[PDB]
Design a protein around this ligand. Structure first.
Ligand SMILES: [Cl-]
Ligand SMILES: [Cl-]
Ligand SMILES: [Cl-]
Ligand SMILES: [Cl-]
Lengths: 264, 266, 265, 184
């Protein structure tokens, strides 16, 4: 804007004043003390040359010119981005995952699952690797609301625990790939025991209907394995959604339980 | 009584050049809506320039193709897709995620994160200290960085912090996670690592004033929900900065780090 | 004198059967045989009493004394003097002095009661920190395979969160080798107010332990100094294995199906 | 009604005593002092175990950490792969497999050897690939035949861990004792 007006009058300007236009056409200029004193000392010109340049540009003088020079830069810059390409690949990978999950939500299903946890006597969260930390996280959150739950992160524990579940148990299995055999095959063992089974996967079903519920979670935005964000995060979206539905079932009794940590 | 987008194209057809007319004929077909009508796929279908398409949109009275193609598709819209079908609880959880992204954006100090990435690279052995939800964060970071060749350990108890600080040396880096910013064990332990020569980084959502000592103090996002019970996963504030640091740290000597990461599959 | 000259010096006092045996033992090749006492009898087709009579003719209190001497002479190995270093003997001693002290502390009725409590509970919990956390995990691994619904906890957050959800169908077992781990003692008390039964395993009696349902006294370590003691799990592994053995005999058949279901496909 | 002690108490304690008897017979004193030295020589020491052997690995991590050894215990095979990819010539790995055929541990130790790391296998069965690792330690076999009636599966390894601990403690004892007491 102010750069275009400069170019339109650039010719009418003397070589020295043309130099002053050149300096202010630089982006680096703003990162500098732009008082008339410093500009004159810096470019080794007189005040009069500065005033003549500013009026060449249609302003009454340097003060009006520089007053806009600041505002302009503040009216932009806040419009531009101040984030590195890496900080932005990270921020967009999260935003992309929040967008995609919002498309994936089956809200009736999540309230169905919140009620299943409520009606279960014992609940178990199966996962390995990063999805085993997700399973750990669920146990702490739902324990504070009074759920009897346990987190298991290895194959011995899976088989060991499946053998002692019954129709009053609920097992939530987390397999981002939708392939992790340890988890998938152990959810099938629990069904044979009569327990209800919910599978979380970022990968569509392939006869996944064998489980009580299959929750489709978001795939990652980054195609390369190394460049992705936490493998936990797709699962955390829906844990926090399920948590929010579950908390509202008998919320009054659950807050008593949640608070009795503090109560001596 | 509203002007259908089709009636509009014809109202301007006779103001159009011949090429614009060819574009109009394509867009006047009812079966054209069942196409990918991005500007990049329409140009190739019609073998025209993006500038030629913009001119067509402007002949029809729009500010550009994006405006034109929205109305071309909004009139075909079969439902009130705009309205939020969500329930207040879903939208409470989602705002909590989005708001934390925003507060993270405003808190990032990119020079510090690269520095912390460099601290991890320059250290030979690095330890992550955390309890409860933050111990899960510490364990997650271990999975992230050990697959890039870093010598790291995740600790999740006061006894471990003590046993590890007693053997810490100057070539150690300890990252401590205390969302409240006042966890006595995490803070006491990081001073134990300081006295043993190791560098210390604290992650906290509250600007800790008495702890100007640690090599670095990183301000993390606070949760948007006032009540603890309704908050989202307490890991996520820290996960934001782990992913950022990881992104910074991966670009430092990437070839060897990708080689270690891919060696699993090897 | 050798053992063959004594066998021969009594040969003429011997019965015909005893001389047949003397003939077996006078052979040089016979010491490359299993000379147990039940093996020699089978081979010679004789009775133990007949072998004892043989030994007695040779001047021994019985066969076991005779065969020992017969095997001492041939042997040059010092199967008597220990080959171990002082450090090895000290560790083995500590492990054995713990078998001994454990044995001196066993209260068989108490351990039977404790097994029954585990059976009567619907949910069981094991609380322990450090090395006592590993014991808690092991107990969980052994008892879940007998069908018990149990959980192992290793930090204060876990104890507090789980105690607040405990009810009268709960049984919590706390491991504090020192007997004064504040988190274990307090968590056990919190579990009591929720109505659960409580068992403390400790090597130090403390007045405050009378508050819990049971106090189990475990072995103190032989080594005075912390750094030289053998381990920290060992005193409790002793009693876990004893309680387990008791607990398996309660409805064994059921817990043998659950145990073997793991192997089953 | 059940003698001085009962049949069950005698069985449990006779399993412990027999473990001590078998352990004493099998000890290879020079081997144990060799492993003690190796642990000192390594810059990083790792302990691999599954199930009950995993608890043994966690204890060894606990004990040798208080003496100054930089150690890490691993229970999940995914972690076995992640650590194997970063091990070098100055790493020592102790794998615990009571059966001697738990795949994860065997392949992990092979992988560690490929990276140039010292490897030690604990096993109640003499592994056929005995020379494969720098050392192959023989541990006690359980007295009871039936799996369900056996005493703790940990114990065979706890014996040799304390033996190695007692030897390794004497190497540079004074400095390790200072590290131990820095806790208080
Ligand atoms: Cl991503
Ligand atoms: Cl929140
Ligand atoms: Cl001892
Ligand atoms: Cl046994």
């Amino acid at each position: 804007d102010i750069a275009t007006v400069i170019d339109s009058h650039f010719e009418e300007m003397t070589d020295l004043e043309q130099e002053i236009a050149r300096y202010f056409l630089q982006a680096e200029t703003i990162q500098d003390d732009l008082s008339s004193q410093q500009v004159t000392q810096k470019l080794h010109i007189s005040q009069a040359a500065l005033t003549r340049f500013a009026k060449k540009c249609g302003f009454t003088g340097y003060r009006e010119f520089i007053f806009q020079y600041q505002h302009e830069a503040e009216n932009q810059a806040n419009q531009v981005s101040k984030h590195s390409p890496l900080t932005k690949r990270v921020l967009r990978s999260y935003s992309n995952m929040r967008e995609q999950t919002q498309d994936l939500i089956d809200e009736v299903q999540l309230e169905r699952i919140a009620q299943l946890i409520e009606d279960a006597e014992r609940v178990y969260f199966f996962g390995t690797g990063s999805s085993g930390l997700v399973a750990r996280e669920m146990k702490l959150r739902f324990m504070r609301l009074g759920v009897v739950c346990e987190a298991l992160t290895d194959q011995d524990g899976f088989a060991w625990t499946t053998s002692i579940m019954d129709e009053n148990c609920l097992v939530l299995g987390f397999s981002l790939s939708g392939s992790t055999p340890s988890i998938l095959d152990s959810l099938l063992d629990a069904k044979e025991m009569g327990a209800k089974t919910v599978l979380f996967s970022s990968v569509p079903n392939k006869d996944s209907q064998a489980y009580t519920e299959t929750v489709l979670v978001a795939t990652h935005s980054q195609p390369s394995y190394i460049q992705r964000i936490s493998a936990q995060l797709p699962m955390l979206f829906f844990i926090d959604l399920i948590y929010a539905y579950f908390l509202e079932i008998n919320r009054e009794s659950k807050e008593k339980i949640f608070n009795s940590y503090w109560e001596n």
